[PDB]
Design a protein around this ligand. Structure first.
Ligand SMILES: [Mn+2]
Ligand SMILES: [Mn+2]
Ligand SMILES: [Mn+2]
Lengths: 227, 227, 227
């Protein structure tokens, strides 16, 4: 078993034989229920893009837990110079860790790392296809709709986290299209409600996406499911 | 209705209930029929990439008109520090403005901003899918042929602006392919003849693209069409 | 005819009426059999991405041979300030040189240029579709599996160089998917064995890709074939 907790915005916590957190935007995440000290012992940290609402508190969390950060080469290079343990990958590349397999997926976005007020190159934005004990979790990251998502149809993803808030990411209508592409067994909506710019009709999403035979599990920040 | 004017290179001016200019490359544009002072009152500025031939005179125009620039997060960040009103979005993300809906489409290109002789990160390049009064304008920006363009097929675009210059963008041959993928009501070729590096056979493009059943409207810099 | 030599990692040398090298990662390439002096006269240099293992010795090699580097705008701008002859292009752009035609194909990766310890923006990473005397060579570049590779299917590529190392690039399983997408005449695995992280069952690749009906040519660093 494993307990997958959604902590608001794009934050996803996987508790299993190892503890993995994706896009640990915790401090300054208005809709996140916990502080940094509310997190359990963290073994791995997955970062999809350099943006603050994704990179977030990775630097601190990594150091306090002696955790290792998995992201693209440009983001890891940055983190490395902050004295942070990393495992560099890049888009479409997989690797088998002690806990399972992690694959960086394509995504449409900017991966700019904001340092002070200078925009540093942080490679290209990604998602994550995580295979743990046969189960498969897809974290899309911040992304628009892309045809590269159709590649995941044969993976038979169990739980997929998709953005729905629009403006910066897929809106509700597009996120449904994305779910038909991926055809996961279950979908969880993310990137919404954090600000007013990305308010979304999460009820409508669940309705439309279940017409397409995909179960929608609307997790409020703090709620979770298991695999 | 509305008046869509092509001002050379990738510059497209939409005159409706509000005024919008896409990729305002005015000063320095050898084929642009107008000076900066020629432009009517600008309400919004759409910037597809951080490049000079797209960003262009955005900062000046923005300030003179108290206009808001719509672009990706990284470009809007750089613009903000130059004291410019911005509405940030990113690839595949749409939003509803007072004049209509704007959506950043994917594009295969670079988005470097040239501030000094330093090359700054400007996120990832895009196009724009603009929905005004039930009409849809697709502005591809600078881009090669991409499969993401097929996502636009079902939009039933009214006018599509595609590059044909080659070298930095699609050549005539690939731009025909893009036109068939999108199947718009009409296609207008852009990014050609600005330099001798991109002196392309615009007449041949028209012939070839119309053999595929896609009406072409060749617009000389300064000419326009209505919706 | 022409002699196409693989020199480890992503280094491919094309000897014909002109001499073109792709991603000249020679110094510090443990699987590259030659020193810089082992190279013939270079007329052209093809750089897919800004990464060290691709940009390689392009600056030094260019200066010695008075060669021109073919890469994207952001990369060519950098090399320009190093006093290096460049012909800038970008993704999807083709151009006809004296030796033949070069097109920058899409690729899913990063393209950061590492100056000292600064990660400079080097645009977006690419592949290359080179056509010399009716022959077609696809150098994928460093990349994951993307649907953009299906745009190459109708080219009837004679020889395609695809990465199989995993982690940073496609693994063996995904590279076979990419090969069926492209459907070329021959396929040559690259980006493997250079480090411990990217050891890959090269033999298994050949077996599996030829099961799908695409002849595989395992070239070891220094081996070559003809067209
Ligand atoms: Mn953002
Ligand atoms: Mn350009
Ligand atoms: Mn690399």
């Amino acid at each position: 078993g494993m307990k997958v907790t959604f902590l608001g915005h794009a934050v996803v916590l996987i508790e299993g034989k190892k503890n993995i957190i994706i896009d640990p935007f915790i401090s300054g995440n208005p809709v996140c229920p916990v502080k940094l000290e509310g997190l359990p012992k963290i073994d791995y940290i997955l970062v999809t893009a350099g943006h603050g609402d994704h990179l977030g508190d990775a630097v601190e969390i990594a150091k306090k837990n002696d955790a290792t950060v998995i992201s693209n080469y440009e983001i890891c290079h940055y983190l490395g110079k902050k004295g942070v343990k990393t495992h560099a990958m890049h888009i479409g590349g997989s690797y088998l860790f002690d806990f399972g397999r992690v694959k960086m997926t394509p995504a449409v976005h900017g991966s700019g790392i904001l340092d002070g007020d200078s925009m540093i190159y942080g490679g290209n934005p990604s998602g994550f296809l995580i295979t743990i004990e046969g189960k498969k979790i897809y974290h899309a990251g911040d992304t628009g709709l892309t045809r590269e998502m159709e590649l995941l149809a044969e993976e038979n993803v169990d739980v997929a986290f998709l953005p729905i808030g629009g403006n910066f990411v897929m809106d509700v209508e597009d996120a449904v299209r994305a779910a038909v592409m991926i055809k996961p067994k279950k979908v969880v909506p993310m990137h919404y409600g954090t600000w007013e710019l990305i308010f979304a009709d999460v009820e409508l999403f669940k309705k439309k996406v279940e017409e397409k035979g995909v179960e929608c599990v609307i997790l409020e920040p703090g709620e979770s499911l298991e695999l």
